[PDB]
Design a protein around this ligand. Structure first.
Ligand SMILES: Cc1cc(CCCCCCCOc2ccc(C3=NCCO3)cc2)on1
Lengths: 245, 296, 245, 49, 245
């Protein structure tokens, strides 16, 4: 009664028989905005089930050389579903997330992925190598949306910070000999009650292979990693026309 | 009368579930007597890091321990203890001959990300709320004290930024200014937590404008206005050449600190302010290195 | 809650995830010597943690032809650690033992070891083959100490006794398909309250392959067997200088 | 006054833990009526030598 | 406490460590005939243990092409044991059954058998192919006894009925990745309190491979299926001499 689990939101149900418990970011369940924490005076929308549900956004292929990937969040779910709509139509957005990363293999494969949530995940550049040039990461790199983006210098998380310490963040590991999925529930984290789903990404999801994938030849070589996630307590306000970015 | 699913519908629960509680911890935890344990079914030592939680194994479960009454204080590890230490965050030059700041006045954009020591400490957290004590140490480049009168002026964003030593803005009718001689002890003043956000943000993963976000504008990524507190202007009070080359060092001591969401400590040399850029060709290891894992 | 276990004495902790319960020799936990069971009038030493702890004495390689090994006990731990010292310095010794024999393999290997405790394990000789010569086993064979000694005629335990009946002794098996370690706790057994750790060996530990080790080629061929043991309730008296034998 | 680890320290326990008791056995154990049993979870026959 | 089980009747005990619970046909345990449900006035025999016990009747070999087999019941146990005798000697027979079908393989084999009980399992013929000829199945096909009989058109259960719907009958599956045996307890089912074990077969046992057996070459290719069954509450009346058919 701990390695098996079932997550159900809206009209979606995830199943798993080799889980490793559930992490609750900074020990706090997603909640709605207090009546004294808020400022925006207009009465918000809380679509509920039409937005708070599981969206299986993408699949990556784990290879013996993979460096690791990341997805910025608020963003990732735009353009997709009714959630995406309320996000374009409304100025203000607020919500928590249930992130379920899955990846399975056989008892004969081996490897370990680090799945973490890094709030305010600001990306950096190599500064032109020499570090004299003040370059800046493009809209394509900072906000890749679904499809995510691959890291180029995971050791420093492409931001000059040691990944070795990334675990001070709500994380969980996917060690093939042990489990086949990570589940992290993240509460709304920002210095404001609401913010724009468009120009601000409350956090990023990192999926990095710390112990490389390996297996003797002949075993299925296609080990995918799929990202499924669900907004929780989504609230929107500041209605206007639909804006893309 | 209602539809039920509306009556239960927990939508609109403003309070967070919690799951953890803050307990008193004035001293380090004491060690209690432990004895041998030879049994099945109970394995403290065994853990599953995958879960994402730190090993809760106690010393008592790994060895027969004595009893120790730990009375070591944990006071010096509080945020206030750790942060309420004045540190250099700004430096302003007011030379006689030069290209930097002649004319006799300067405008320092209030940004503490300019110096490595202080910057790294704060970049330990994602959000920080606090008041501060700013102290201004002025003198000549030789470190000599000179009979010169200065005027420091905090210029909130939106206020007229002085364009010359004799700018009308120095009337400082509503801005807070300070007049000090370099012969008087360094000026010190108390600043509150100004900012429309509930906390200053060391890292802002996003943009502030809502536009096209083309190449040229990638300069604005990570730029969060809730952190731009305005500028700090200084001038030698008068209408003629200073007569002495000056320098002002700005020290900041945080107080009444609250911090949130710890992050990994800075790994690579810093390159620019409000921009985590690192040197791609000089990516060094977090620390020292050996020759083999089987040798010290 | 029975296949996993943790043994902790002194500053040592053994772990196991494929155990087969714990045997307690003749159903009795090691105890200290009664005030009316004793004779030696001097007040004894009970070093406690410095001696009652796990000593991992040696590793043997199990092979498809291995005959089996044995270790005489009191002896085995001399010369090693603070225990060894109190044993050389003192005339009288007394103690129980927690013996943990470990050996693991894969779910694709197979074999079965008999791990038993045979009190007063007197060794015999082949008597010159014909049995006319009254030979006697050497100090090297009777008291091998660590490193143990290999059996030459396991069927009779090199002593003219059927191993088929060795199970009337506190034993336990290491069947690879089932477990990977044996744990036997032995109380002090002698006809005297204390005796010399040097010239007397209260019992011997037998580790014999009854069902040969086997595996298809390609699987790691080096299957070791390691002996770890811990004295319990060690008591010493009769202090003098240090004597080796 | 004492150091605690000395107060618990079970060192010096002269009596043995036991774990078994000798019961009267003047005769062989009798056999009691048994009936069919078709159930899951209960396996007498299965052992782990 | 559900994947392991032990069945004990008479002097027979079946064991299993990869069971999938037990099915009780139409939710009813075998009972003896009511005093008001009966008509035959003679006092019956209830041999008990000599007949209500496990008879392991036969083994079939499951192959990558196997179509499936069936056994008619009352019949199957005649000629075998004391049960068979009471059935030939008496006119009237009545009884329930505990059917335990077993078949095991390795965690590397795969396949799935449908084990069902189909009451009044009347067999049909292909009608000469064209369906113009009114052929009829032989005594060898309708009542094969032990050894059972192989199906020729399992899709229609050799009787013009969809096997796809055979599950509305007390059934159970043997999915190799999951279990290695089926256990179904069947109560006496007929429109009469007693009937002749000889000319009437209250039901048939179907064992059909729905998901074909498969495995990479090199793994033991001989996967047998064994049928073991035990009568329950056997009652006989109408004593005369022994009749075979
Ligand atoms: C009198 C008087 C007082 C002063 C100076 C008052 C300064 C108050 C400064 C408060 C600064 O808070 C900060 C928060 C964030 C950052 C920051 N820099 C990079 C992004 O975050 C800098 C300062 O001048 N004259």
């Amino acid at each position: 009664s701990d390695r098996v689990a079932q997550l159900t939101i809206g009209n979606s149900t995830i199943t798993t028989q080799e889980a490793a418990n559930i992490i609750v970011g900074y020990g706090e369940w997603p909640s709605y905005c207090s009546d004294d924490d808020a400022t925006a005076v207009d009465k918000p929308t809380r679509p509920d089930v039409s937005v708070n549900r599981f969206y299986t956004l993408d699949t990556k292929l784990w290879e013996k050389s993979s460096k690791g990937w990341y997805w910025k969040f608020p963003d990732v779910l735009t353009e997709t579903g009714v959630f995406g709509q309320n996000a374009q139509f409304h100025y203000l957005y607020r919500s928590g997330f249930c992130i379920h990363v899955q990846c399975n293999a056989s008892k004969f494969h081996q490897g370990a992925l680090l799945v973490a949530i890094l709030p305010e995940y600001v990306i950096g550049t190599v500064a032109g190598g020499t570090g004299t040039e003040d370059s800046h990461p493009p809209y394509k790199q900072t906000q890749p949306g679904a499809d995510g983006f691959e890291l180029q210098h995971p050791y420093v998380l492409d931001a000059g910070i040691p990944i070795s310490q990334l675990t001070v963040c709500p994380h969980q590991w996917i060690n093939l000999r042990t489990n086949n999925c990570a589940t992290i529930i993240v509460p709304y984290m920002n210095t404001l009650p609401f913010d724009s789903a468009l120009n601000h990404c409350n956090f990023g999801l990192l999926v990095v292979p710390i112990s490389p994938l390996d297996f003797d030849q002949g075993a299925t070589p296609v080990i995918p990693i799929t990202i499924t996630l669900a907004p929780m307590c989504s609230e929107f306000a500041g209605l206007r026309q639909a804006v893309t970015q | 009368d209602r539809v039920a699913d509306v009556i239960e519908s927990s939508i609109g629960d403003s309070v967070s579930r919690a799951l953890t509680q803050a307990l008193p911890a004035p001293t380090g935890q004491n060690t209690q007597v432990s004895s041998h344990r030879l049994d099945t079914g109970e394995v403290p030592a065994l853990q599953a890091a995958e879960i994402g939680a730190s090993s809760n194994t106690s010393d008592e479960s790994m060895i027969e321990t004595r009893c120790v009454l730990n009375s070591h204080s944990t006071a010096e590890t509080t945020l206030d203890s750790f942060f309420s230490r004045a540190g250099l965050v700004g430096e302003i030059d007011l030379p006689l001959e030069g290209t930097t700041n002649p004319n006799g006045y300067a405008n320092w954009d209030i940004d503490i990300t300019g110096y490595a020591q202080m910057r790294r400490k704060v970049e330990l957290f994602t959000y920080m709320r606090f008041d501060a004590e700013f102290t201004f140490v002025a003198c000549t480049p030789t470190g000599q004290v000179v009979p010169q009168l200065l005027q420091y002026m905090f210029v909130p964003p939106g206020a007229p930024k002085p364009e010359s030593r004799e700018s009308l803005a120095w009337q400082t009718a509503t801005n807070p200014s300070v007049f000090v001689k370099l012969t008087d002890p360094p000026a010190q003043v108390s600043v509150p937590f100004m900012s429309p956000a509930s906390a200053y943000q060391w890292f802002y993963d996003g943009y502030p404008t809502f536009g096209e976000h083309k190449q040229e504008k990638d300069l604005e990524y990570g730029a969060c206005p809730n952190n731009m507190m305005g500028t700090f202007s200084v001038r030698n009070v008068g209408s003629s050449k200073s007569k002495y080359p000056l320098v002002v060092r700005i020290y900041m001591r945080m107080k009444h600190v609250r911090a949130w969401i710890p992050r990994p400590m800075r790994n690579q040399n810093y390159l620019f302010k409000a921009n985590p850029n690192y040197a791609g060709n000089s990516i060094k290891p977090t620390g020292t290195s050996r020759t083999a894992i089987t040798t010290l």
